[PDB]
């Protein structure tokens, strides 16, 4: 038996992001003026890409949740307990992360 985090911060009971004010936040960014008091189009560009990330996240979270389970099922209990001792940090380029979502 074991536990794993659900990918993309989606609660399966509600089938939505953990933050319940996400849609309100995206709309707030769209109307917001940023980097200047006059609009620089930052809000429109960021809100458009943030909405696309959320839509792709909500549509494709089931496959990644199943994928993590299948990978976990390939590990014996003895090997998993050993890997609990190790630790590390992964560095991702900003271009790779945005392109991933």
């Amino acid at each position: 038996v074991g536990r794993y985090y659900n990918p993309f911060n989606i609660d399966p009971l509600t089938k939505k992001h953990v933050e319940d004010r996400l849609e309100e936040f995206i709309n707030q960014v769209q109307v917001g003026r940023f980097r200047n008091a006059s609009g620089n189009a930052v809000g429109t560009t960021l809100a458009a890409f943030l909405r696309a990330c959320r839509d792709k996240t909500s549509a494709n979270w089931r496959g990644y949740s199943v994928l993590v389970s299948r990978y976990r099922s390939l590990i014996p209990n003895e090997l998993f307990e050993s890997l609990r001792n190790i630790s590390g940090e992964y560095n991702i380029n900003p271009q790779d992360e945005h392109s991933f979502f």
């Binding site: 009971l13 509600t14 953990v18 319940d20």
Partner: protein, 298 residues
């Protein structure tokens, strides 16, 4: 000859005659169904980080979305359910709610509204009359468990007649010391601690020897047709809550400790079968009242 009777059996006040048609029975059942969802959605919302389940349940119950500033009273359904409860208890209570509102509220859910498909067992002990000889003192205490303390100061044994009514199914008699009890015109059996009797059999004669006070403990069971959704624990809680809220405060009515005590008294009075038909609907209404008010306390 002296007569002793149960305190809860005397003068059962008339019950209401309104809201007993098919449409009103549907409304009470619909109220029970939506009140159950309110409690369960309340626990689901508290357990998780989202109040969406509670908003969905309250919207169906109150026809409006909950607001932070406003007190969650319950909407039009809460007002209707309270007024219907008052109407059932006494015939003197007004029938405030119009039928058009009841029909509108009854359309929220698809329920049968049949109130006589199941049964329930009620534990109130009906002692209609205990007839005693001149030198004998008899006292009856309690309803759920009736303790009949009997003392005779005469020279010889005395015969005391018990009458448990014709409605109770079985009555169990237990005594502090073994005693003799038999039906009319039957030989007395040997002294025993426990007696099981059918109340319809007839008046029961108990022999009382001199000295050594004899106290008899009585427990009874009665079967009354009720809807399948009936829950005795939730009905009793609603009865006390409604009584504390003044839903039963009205001139010239009798007050009872429990819904168990209330429904048995109406059964034993004249025109009882049609009285308990209304009391059962009141029980389901109180079961809904208990659930709604616990989720929405005012």
């Amino acid at each position: 000859a002296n007569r002793a009777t149960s305190a809860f059996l005397d003068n059962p006040h008339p019950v209401g005659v309104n809201y007993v048609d098919e449409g009103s029975r549907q409304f009470v059942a619909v109220a029970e169904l939506l009140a159950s969802k309110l409690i369960d959605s309340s626990r689901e919302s508290d357990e998780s980080n989202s109040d969406v389940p509670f908003v969905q349940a309250y919207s169906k119950f109150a026809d409006d979305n909950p607001r932070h500033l406003r007190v969650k009273t319950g909407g039009k359904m809460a007002n209707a359910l309270t007024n219907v409860i008052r109407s059932y208890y006494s015939i003197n209570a007004p029938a405030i709610v119009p039928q058009v509102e009841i029909d509108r509220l009854a359309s929220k859910a698809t329920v049968s509204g049949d109130m006589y498909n199941s049964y329930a067992i009620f534990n109130s002990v009906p002692i209609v009359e205990v007839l005693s000889p001149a030198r004998t003192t008899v006292s009856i205490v309690g309803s759920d468990r009736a303790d009949v303390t009997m003392l005779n100061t005469g020279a010889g044994a005395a015969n005391i007649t018990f009458n448990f009514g014709q409605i109770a199914e079985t009555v169990i008699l237990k005594g502090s010391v073994p005693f003799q009890l038999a039906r009319l015109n039957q030989p007395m059996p040997a002294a025993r601690f426990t007696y099981k009797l059918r109340p319809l059999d007839g008046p029961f004669i108990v022999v009382l020897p001199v000295g050594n006070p004899l106290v008899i403990s009585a427990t009874a069971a009665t079967r009354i047709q009720v809807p399948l959704a009936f829950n005795k624990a939730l009905v009793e809680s609603g009865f006390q809550t409604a009584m504390n809220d003044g839903l039963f405060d009205i001139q010239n009515v009798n007050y009872y400790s429990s819904f168990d005590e209330f429904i048995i008294s109406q059964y034993h009075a004249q025109d009882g079968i049609n009285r308990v038909s209304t009391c059962v609907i009141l029980g389901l209404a109180l079961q809904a009242y208990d659930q709604m008010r616990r989720a929405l306390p005012v």
